[PDB]
Design a protein around this ligand. Structure first.
Ligand SMILES: CCn1cc(CNC(=O)c2cccnc2)cn1
Ligand SMILES: [Cl-]
Ligand SMILES: [Mg+2]
Ligand SMILES: [Mg+2]
Ligand SMILES: [Mg+2]
Ligand SMILES: [Mg+2]
Lengths: 194, 194
């Protein structure tokens, strides 16, 4: 019933563009929206985010997160490891690679979402969420080696899965960090389950 | 270590702008980023709210109330938590309960309110509060609830059982062209993972 009629470029940077989208509303009235897109998409999605479940015997299961300065936020954020998918790369492969580069952990794929939207009122940006388990007792994950790309500066923060939401709240309260909405949503549901 | 040095307007719409962000990297070197912001944020502690609405009714399994809308940036239909921008002077809780009623017809009760969390921090400064609200589906107010959508706003309500959320989302994605939001999918995943 609703659909895109046209898109007008407003401004294109190296990484991001802003468009004016014209669309037909379900009454048959014509309407405009300001839309953001990445200039990098080729892929099933722009990016992957990895939910990394660190499993060590005789320990709580942990969710492995990352902390990094985010220029658009003007501050540090706590997030799932994540990055853009390389042209020709599979989401699964992008997940294991990003996870290794950002955390040093080598992990196994458990499940992979369809493409899901990041902020559909604002952008067309999509990701695959990839659940990965990490056998923390294997020698390759003993002293995990983070291999950052150029200009990446990532701190790793592992938090117990069964207390994730209280732990994140603590970090916000004391460290003045910004938690990612997908992280926070996952944490909420761990508490809301049953 | 890292901080913003300057922010230069590249293009400003009515709703969104694009900025050339200059910052200090942790090595002491100056770098740039392209940043999206909204033009609408004033003194709100966040741009918007998303509501996690837990519909509770005697002798029913709890349902998560979700909305389906056409999203011009995406060029299609998306399934999301009920959400909107926080009006100037409005509390996040008030905005959550107001958007929930407008989008779904339901009158909720506040359960909890997150701190400001980031929507896509590699791209934008956009933030929300994620507000958990219970809905007393036994109350006569919530019996046959009518959305009160604004001018040009057209929302469908989809209530799904919490205890099977991920499979039910997967089944809807299998039947039609539509994208699930990343926060909704994250929440459904953690419910499975718990
Ligand atoms: C469908 C009816 N309607 C019109 C508006 C006004 N436009 C915007 O809020 C907006 C925000 C971000 C980018 N572009 C446009 C809100 N609902
Ligand atoms: Cl798991
Ligand atoms: Mg990354
Ligand atoms: Mg990376
Ligand atoms: Mg809305
Ligand atoms: Mg609304």
């Amino acid at each position: 019933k609703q659909y895109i009629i046209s898109e007008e470029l407003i401004s294109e940077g190296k990484w991001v563009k802003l468009e004016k989208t014209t669309y037909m509303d379900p009454t048959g009235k014509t309407r405009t929206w300001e839309s953001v897109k990445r200039t990098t998409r080729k892929q099933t999605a722009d990016g992957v985010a990895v939910i990394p479940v660190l499993q060590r015997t005789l320990h709580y299961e942990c969710i492995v997160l990352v902390k990094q300065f985010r220029p658009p936020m003007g501050g540090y954020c706590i997030e799932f490891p994540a990055g853009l998918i390389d042209d020709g790369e599979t989401p699964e492969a992008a997940a294991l690679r990003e996870l290794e580069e950002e955390t040093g952990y080598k992990g196994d794929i458990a499940e992979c979402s369809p493409a899901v939207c990041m902020d559909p009122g604002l952008s067309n940006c999509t990701i695959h969420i990839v659940t990965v388990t990490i056998n923390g007792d294997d020698a390759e994950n003993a002293r995990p080696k983070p291999k950052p790309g150029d200009g990446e500066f990532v701190e790793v923060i592992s938090l117990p899965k069964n207390d994730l939401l209280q732990r994140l709240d603590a970090l916000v309260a004391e460290e003045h960090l910004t938690v990612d909405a997908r992280v926070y949503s996952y944490a909420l549901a761990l508490k809301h389950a049953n």
